[PDB]
Each structure stands twice: as structure tokens, then as C-alpha cells.
Amino acid sequence: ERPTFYRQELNKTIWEVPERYQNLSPVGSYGSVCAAFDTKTGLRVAVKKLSRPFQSIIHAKRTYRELRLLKHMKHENVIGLLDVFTPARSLEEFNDVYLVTHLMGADLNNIVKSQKLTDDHVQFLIYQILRGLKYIHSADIIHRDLKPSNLAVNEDSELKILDFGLCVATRWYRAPEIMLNWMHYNQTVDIWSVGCIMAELLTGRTLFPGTDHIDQLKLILRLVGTPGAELLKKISSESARNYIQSLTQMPKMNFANVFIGANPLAVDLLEKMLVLDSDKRITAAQALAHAYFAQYHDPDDEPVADPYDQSLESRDLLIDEWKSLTYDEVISFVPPPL
Ligand SMILES: Cc1cccc(-n2nc(C(C)(C)C)cc2NC(=O)Nc2cccc(Nc3ncnc4ccc(N)cc34)c2)c1
Ligand SMILES: CCCCCCCCO[C@@H]1O[C@H](CO)[C@@H](O)[C@H](O)[C@H]1O
Ligand SMILES: CCCCCCCCO[C@@H]1O[C@H](CO)[C@@H](O)[C@H](O)[C@H]1O
Incomplete structure (x- = not known):
């Protein structure tokens, strides 16, 4: 066979x-x-x-x-x-x-470049990202590079999340804590990315178009405000803190004034995604229950991952041990239904 x-x-x-x-x-x-x-x-x-x-x-x-x-x-x-x-x-x-x-x-980038999106279109696209992320996140996996060019959107606006290799800069959609090299990450980094994408489908432009990671950070702080004392203190490097402190103290922008023509519910969700403190961002599960998606939300059809353990970054094996495990998975593969 x-x-x-x-x-x-x-x-x-x-x-x-x-x-x-x-x-x-x-x-x-x-x-x-x-x-x-x-x-x-x-x-x-x-x-x-x-x-x-x-x-x-x-x-x-x-x-x-x-x-x-x-x-x-x-x-x-x-x-x-x-x-x-x-x-x-x-x-x-x-x-x-x-x-x-x-x-x-096409990817999501082909969409936003080709047309101005109605609010319903934005709803359906963002709902689908969050439903997929809810599922990915439940397996204990972080995507880390959620951007429009990693998001396939078919002819009927069905969206799939994947890794598109290099078939739109990654840094535009990156949570600030990654560009600060924070050692340990929340899945919440991906929710930052969704906020950036959602904003861009609502306005048609990149939310934070940094030319490099320093520009990227400045642009971020301009919108969300410079961090407060307790956030500042979580940054262990004095030189880093000093640079951040040295920036002109930016107030938090009112998202309702910024995104003046958007659905007030999209704006509220946006506020809950683009919070500086990663512990305080809305989760994908929570986001799915947000009133912005009451048209698409079904708690009986937002499933989570199967029980297989996919938490492997911690795992240290020998090169030939990874190959043999890989071979077992190739051998035991069973193709899906139609
Ligand atoms: C540990 C690891 C390493 C690398 C990638 C992943 N990864 N993670 C995911 C998530 C479930 C977290 C979203 C997905 C991948 N990998 C993935 O998407 N792989 C893959 C497999 C077969 C084909 C493709 N790419 C194309 N497919 C379908 N049409 C195309 C059309 C044009 C081009 N240029 C590419 C393609 C991509 C995970
Ligand atoms: C998490 C710690 C953040 C501190 C990073 C500080 C680096 C920013 O300092 C640098 O200023 C240079 C001026 O010489 C400019 O070329 C750049 O805008 C910037 O990269
Ligand atoms: C330039 C200033 C940017 C402020 C960056 C603050 C990011 C806060 O997000 C932080 O993420 C860490 C990694 O998941 C967590 O351990 C912290 O508890 C959380 O507060």
C-alpha cells in the first residue's frame, strides 16, 4: 500500500x-x-x-x-x-x-488592499480569527506571528490561520513585550496582534507602521500611553527603564475619538485588546462573547483542541530522538474525511 x-x-x-x-x-x-x-x-x-x-x-x-x-x-x-x-x-x-x-x-492583506470593509465584514473576519485562536490557544500554543499575510481568506470570506513562510512587516502586529525581549510570553501576545489587525480592517491603514522596533514602540506608546509605575517596575533593566522614562510622557488616547467612524462596540473591543499589560488584555474565549460578535457568536460551536499534549518548547531530546518520534507520527497518520 x-x-x-x-x-x-x-x-x-x-x-x-x-x-x-x-x-x-x-x-x-x-x-x-x-x-x-x-x-x-x-x-x-x-x-x-x-x-x-x-x-x-x-x-x-x-x-x-x-x-x-x-x-x-x-x-x-x-x-x-x-x-x-x-x-x-x-x-x-x-x-x-x-x-x-x-x-x-488570497490572504487578509489582499482583502484590505482591494476594498473598504463594511462593519459586518470586519465582524466576520475578526470573529473567525478569534474562534481559531481560541482553539489554538487551548492546545497551549502561541502563534507569535499573527499578521494579515498569515491569514488565508477564501472567496466566501472563510478565514484560516496558518504559517505562510514568506509567500506587511511582522513588527507592525507584534506585542511590545516581544520587542522588549521579555523572556516568558502570554498567549495574550496574539490578542495584541488581533487588535492591530482589527483596527486596520476598520480604518484601512496599518495601526502602528514602525520603520524599526524603536519606532514601533514609540508609535505604540503614543496610542496606549506611557506605562505607569507598576508596569515600569516589571522592566528589570535600568537602562531600558531610563529610555522609556525619557520619552515624552504620552497620555492614553481616547479610542472613540481616534476611531471616530467605527462601531462603538468594535472600539470597546479594541480598547480591551490593545492594553499594555498583557495580563489585562481580553482572551480569545472572552472576546468571542463580546457584544461586537452577537451576530456570529455560538458557544456551542467554538470548540477547543483535542487532549493531545502540544507543549514541547520545554522538551530537550537528542537529534535522532526527534527524528524517530517524527517517523512514528508519519507512520500513524490517518487522512481526514471529505
Ligand atoms: C511548529 C511549527 C513550525 C512551523 C509552522 C507551524 N505552524 N503552526 C501553525 C498554526 C496551527 C499555529 C497556525 C501552522 C503551521 N504550519 C503551517 O501552516 N504549515 C504549512 C504546511 C503546508 C503548507 C503550508 N503553506 C501553504 N499551505 C497552503 N497553501 C499555500 C499557498 C502558498 C504558499 N506559499 C504556502 C501555502 C504551510 C508550526
Ligand atoms: C526594553 C528596553 C528599551 C530600551 C531601548 C533603547 C534603544 C533606543 O535608543 C535608540 O535611539 C537611537 C539614538 O541614538 C535611535 O537610532 C533609535 O531611535 C533607538 O533605537
Ligand atoms: C515600551 C513599554 C512597553 C510596556 C511592556 C509591558 C508589557 C506587559 O505585559 C507583561 O507581559 C509579561 C510577559 O507575558 C508578563 O510576565 C507581565 O506580567 C505582563 O505585565
Whole structure:
């Protein structure tokens, strides 16, 4: 029942895939992606060939982690795994991993650049991000790079969260605590990102268009206000505190005056996302129950992740141990229903 593989060279990369996958066409290059046609199903898929997956410890772990994660992501608003394969017949020759998903077209960036969004459109797009994030966050995973170009939006405005490689600067959507190199992060960093995206769908422009992380920080403080005493004290570096203290003391802007033409409920939600203290930001679960989404909110259809443990950053293993765990997951993979 092993499929028949065929070999092919594209952009100085060898691709060896099952014959069911035809018309491979490179769309991006750590892992490179081909648009392809699944002859079995008639569907357009993306095939990602991971770059040298077991050639560094960092790669081996990431490889295992992406596979184990995606094997368990089964949600309307999160990318799912259609297939996973390797040309290896044994663990001893296992050097390559390929992941297959539905092929995405436009991202959220294509939307906001192509049109001005009505409030209902903003509602549906943001609701779907939060529903997916609720699910991702429940598995104890942080996305860390939630931005419009990582958000696929199909022709009927169905949104999926994924990692789009480099197929819009990341720093525009980054919580301030990441750019301050805070060692430990809340999932709340992603909610900061949603606030930035939501603002941009309401106004049509990047909320905080920093040219670098210092500019980025200045722009942030201009809107939310410079931190108070207790926030300041959580910043352990005196030089960092001194630089922050040295900035002209910015008052907190009134979001209702800033976003003057927006739904007052969108503005209220915005205020709850873009709070400086990460402990005080609304959660995705809480956000979903916000009155802004009363049109789309259904507490019986906002599910959470299955019970598999996906908390792996803490885990230290040997390079060949990550490969063998990865091999087990490839072998035990069972393709989803239609
Ligand atoms: C540990 C780890 C490492 C790297 C990525 C992830 N990760 N995390 C996620 C979340 C569930 C947290 C959102 C998703 C990923 N990975 C992911 O999205 N992988 C993936 C797998 C197969 C294909 C693609 N990319 C394309 N797919 C579908 N059409 C395309 C159309 C054009 C292009 N250029 C790319 C594609 C992307 C996790
Ligand atoms: C968390 C600690 C934050 C402190 C970072 C302070 C770095 C900002 O100081 C720097 O000022 C330079 C002037 O010489 C400018 O080129 C830049 O705007 C800025 O990066
Ligand atoms: C330039 C000034 C920016 C202020 C940054 C404050 C960010 C506050 O968010 C902080 O996040 C940390 C990481 O999750 C948590 O440990 C802290 O308890 C929380 O207060």
C-alpha cells in the first residue's frame, strides 16, 4: 500500500512525491512549497517540502512539532493536514518530510488592499480569527506571528490561520513585550496582534507602521500611553527603564475619538485588546462573547483542541530522538474525511 513515487527537480530542489500529486508548481521557498493537483480528489493542494529537517537539532524538533501539531488541528479556521509523506521505506533512510494542505489563494492583506470593509465584514473576519485562536490557544500554543499575510481568506470570506513562510512587516502586529525581549510570553501576545489587525480592517491603514522596533514602540506608546509605575517596575533593566522614562510622557488616547467612524462596540473591543499589560488584555474565549460578535457568536460551536499534549518548547531530546518520534507520527497518520 506504499504509493509509487516519482522524482523531479524544481529550483535546484529534488521533489519526490506520490504519483497522485501532479502539476507541481513552485510558489515559495524553512521549507519550500509547490501548488499541485491531487488526482485522487481533484483538489488543488499545497505541498511543503521541509528544508533539511533532521540536519540540526533545531530543525529536528521543529519538524516533529509542526507535524504533531498539524496532525491535530481540525478546525474551520485553522489550517488542516490532508497528507504527510516521506520517500523513505525505513527510519534509517528517513531524511525528508512533505506536508500537504488545501491550497490557499488570497490572504487578509489582499482583502484590505482591494476594498473598504463594511462593519459586518470586519465582524466576520475578526470573529473567525478569534474562534481559531481560541482553539489554538487551548492546545497551549502561541502563534507569535499573527499578521494579515498569515491569514488565508477564501472567496466566501472563510478565514484560516496558518504559517505562510514568506509567500506587511511582522513588527507592525507584534506585542511590545516581544520587542522588549521579555523572556516568558502570554498567549495574550496574539490578542495584541488581533487588535492591530482589527483596527486596520476598520480604518484601512496599518495601526502602528514602525520603520524599526524603536519606532514601533514609540508609535505604540503614543496610542496606549506611557506605562505607569507598576508596569515600569516589571522592566528589570535600568537602562531600558531610563529610555522609556525619557520619552515624552504620552497620555492614553481616547479610542472613540481616534476611531471616530467605527462601531462603538468594535472600539470597546479594541480598547480591551490593545492594553499594555498583557495580563489585562481580553482572551480569545472572552472576546468571542463580546457584544461586537452577537451576530456570529455560538458557544456551542467554538470548540477547543483535542487532549493531545502540544507543549514541547520545554522538551530537550537528542537529534535522532526527534527524528524517530517524527517517523512514528508519519507512520500513524490517518487522512481526514471529505
Ligand atoms: C511548529 C511549527 C513550525 C512551523 C509552522 C507551524 N505552524 N503552526 C501553525 C498554526 C496551527 C499555529 C497556525 C501552522 C503551521 N504550519 C503551517 O501552516 N504549515 C504549512 C504546511 C503546508 C503548507 C503550508 N503553506 C501553504 N499551505 C497552503 N497553501 C499555500 C499557498 C502558498 C504558499 N506559499 C504556502 C501555502 C504551510 C508550526
Ligand atoms: C526594553 C528596553 C528599551 C530600551 C531601548 C533603547 C534603544 C533606543 O535608543 C535608540 O535611539 C537611537 C539614538 O541614538 C535611535 O537610532 C533609535 O531611535 C533607538 O533605537
Ligand atoms: C515600551 C513599554 C512597553 C510596556 C511592556 C509591558 C508589557 C506587559 O505585559 C507583561 O507581559 C509579561 C510577559 O507575558 C508578563 O510576565 C507581565 O506580567 C505582563 O505585565
